Amino acid sequence: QCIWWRGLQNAANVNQTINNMIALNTISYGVRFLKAKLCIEVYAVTRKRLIQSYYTDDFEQGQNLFIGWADRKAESIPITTPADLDETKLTVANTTLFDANNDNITKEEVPTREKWCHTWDLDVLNHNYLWEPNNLDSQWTLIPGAQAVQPTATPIGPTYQEIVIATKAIGANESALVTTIQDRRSYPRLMLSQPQIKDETDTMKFKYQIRISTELEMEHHIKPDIANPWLTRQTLPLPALSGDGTTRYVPCVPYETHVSQ
Amino acid sequence: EGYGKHITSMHVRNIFNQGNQVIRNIVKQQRYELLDFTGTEAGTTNLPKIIPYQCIWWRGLQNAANVNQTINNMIALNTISYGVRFLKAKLCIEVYAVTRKRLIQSYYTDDFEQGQNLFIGWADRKAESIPITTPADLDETKLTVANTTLFDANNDNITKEEVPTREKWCHTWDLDVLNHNYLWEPNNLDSQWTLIPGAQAVQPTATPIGPTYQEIVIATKAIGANESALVTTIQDRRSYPRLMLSQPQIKDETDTMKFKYQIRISTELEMEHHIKPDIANPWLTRQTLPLPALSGDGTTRYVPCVPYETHVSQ
Amino acid sequence: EGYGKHITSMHVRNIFNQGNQVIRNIVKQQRYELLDFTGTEAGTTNLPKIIPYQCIWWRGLQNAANVNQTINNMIALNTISYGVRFLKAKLCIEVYAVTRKRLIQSYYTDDFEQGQNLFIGWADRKAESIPITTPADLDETKLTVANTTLFDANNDNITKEEVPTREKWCHTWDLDVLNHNYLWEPNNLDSQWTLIPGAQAVQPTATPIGPTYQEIVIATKAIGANESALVTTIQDRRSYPRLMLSQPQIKDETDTMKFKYQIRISTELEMEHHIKPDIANPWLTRQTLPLPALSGDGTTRYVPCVPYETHVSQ
Amino acid sequence: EGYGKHITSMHVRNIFNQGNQVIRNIVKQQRYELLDFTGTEAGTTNLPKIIPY
């Protein structure tokens, strides 16, 4: 849901694609995201076995990595620092993919050398609108698409509603009225989990060695050959959650119901 | 290797609704009523009655006695639904009698005017309104406006249907106005100032009706102090002019010639409830819009009842 | 003569349901559970577990935590329904792991026995039962009978499916048993001694189960001191043998070789609620039958779980 | 065995360009200019101008 697609969790993961993006953002008045391809590869499934005391790790090839979509629930992602965006350490307390009572998660199940791929359509915009470029350098900026849910603590703004209304300073003299219709998106919380397996002592502990590949297709619409500051008129602020809040909750709505006319 | 019956390598399975569930209930309200133009007080007068279909009177909230399982069904289905869309509202007036009060001496007798009709005006072509104070006021028998008629000796501005007794007057509305996969957030229809879906962009300053009456909707929802939803739609405009029941204005020796109609008024309001998903999702409010309604401290509040909507050829 | 639009001489019209309305809700309960044969106490032992599908555990009443809108939907739909018919009950066990407790020295470690299976016995061919005391007891993880196994060294009387981990075990029942336009009178499924539709004609004297377990039903309903209903049906017989989950009995040096299974158990109980008609009709109880259940003061009560039903060729 | 959606045994995958990317920009320069052979100084003279392409 966040702009972590840049890999902003760590600077070490920068690459020319970011640098390309950064530059192409300087020279582009607006950008539209096309398709975001996420692929997790599991290179191992490892269990920590207890002996005595200390633990050894043994290969559980034959178990799987769980990818939950956390659909069917209204849940969120706290985001404080870009580090927090790390999908390895990013967590919520008292949280699981497994409820002994109502198991509310649609959980894919991944063997090691089986690969888990997903793709999103960020083409949400229309009426010839774009998104105004940023370097994707913030963790509170979010992917295109409308989760109309926003906290009062951190007003996310009009970009999360189908009917967008916003203004742009773009100089004290002029102001732009950006108004669109963007189809609604859900973007439920996507979790990686181990199985909950009860050992003699406690929950049965695993560690997964995966490779996580991202491709975020970005069509930069380049600044015209002549200065036109008013192309902001067609761009919309990157969808983002504002406010002084140190920790800020990404909506991650489960889904969108549909009505038959 | 597993040899058991009806066993297969699991696919991706979670069985929960994801909001895809929908229920169609029809709240229907059927009344044999006294429509009386004879009396001198309390909406019994020559004043043409008003059927406040613009309002949520379709529940029959004018009186509690008219509650039925359709309401109770609706109420429950509202508790368990995150949103509802109104489909078609079928109003049918049946006239079982047309009665005149004749004067003799003094006291009056009533004689059958079979051969006269009940007038149903649409009060199109005029900008007029319905005052709504209490749900009682919603009663289409007593609901009136002063100095009001279906008959102007100068410009007769009303398109008035004319109903024989056992002839029936039916109408149907399309409340499907919403789109972009938006709904209306449920209420029990227990207020008289809530109004039918559709956009009469007219609203008084005294009682701001809000964004649900404009084609382009913009509103927010608290739904907790932490999150807020931006509900933005395009809903086609609706007119919903004032629908009156009237007697003919016929000048007797004394005064206007007084009638009383014994009718049955049948309502069917098709409501597709979109059920709360099998898992808690408070953010489905995101797709719902507040019931269109007129707010404010005002005791009496005026329902717009716009005549019509002009059309432009491109 | 009446010239209005959509007007016609009235036919015979009353719009009320007359009971013709029906709603299909699916109560579905999905659990990732610890199925443990290792422990020495409280249903953790070698004793084969029991899935009490004969009981109304399909609600997940074993624990309140497993409530979901399907129950809440059911509950409400029961308030507004005069009767309900169960359609198909889909049980699916998914095995996410097969785990053995290995002994070293002393303490145990758990190792993956992928390559062994979970046993699902039907406990057919035997007359056996399920003791039910509390809804907790309905938990298929802890639900057991003493001196009980899927493995007899002498006559092995159980038809036992065998499930690899990511192989899934699904079953489906037909609860459509009723006919002659009878239904079951709704309950919230909040009791553990209520049982699934279908006739196991066996009932204990200690806890008379009643006429709903015989093909030919005869019962009365108070439904007020003034009137009483005679509910008489023909419902085909059902067997519903005891369904156990077990580990293999494998003799280690010490004792039986202990496993624990991490499974997910998914339930879908299709329920067609027949909604209360749009007008009060307390006598629709006439067509409903009491939920099949075992009565009596008994704290612990034995669910029949008959093995099967023989068939005769005419 | 893996049952998830859009899952397949990995092929050889590294996604990096390997230089295969190319961009076509057109630098274009458009001028309404004074070309003057009249003046007596500083390239304004009868001398034929040169376009240093």
Residue numbers in the entry:
A (entry chain A): 102 to 153, 158 to 366
B (entry chain A), C (entry chain A): 49 to 153, 158 to 366
D (entry chain A): 49 to 101
What sentences appear in the manuscript?
We report the discovery of a parvovirus with a bipartite genome, Acheta domesticus segmented densovirus (AdSDV), isolated from house crickets (Acheta domesticus), in which it is pathogenic. Our structural and molecular examinations revealed that the AdSDV packages one genome segment per particle. The AdSDV capsid displayed an overall “smooth” capsid surface with the only protruding area surrounding the fivefold symmetry axis. The AdSDV VP subunit displayed the canonical eight-stranded jelly roll fold, complemented by an N-terminal βA, located on an elongated N-terminal region.
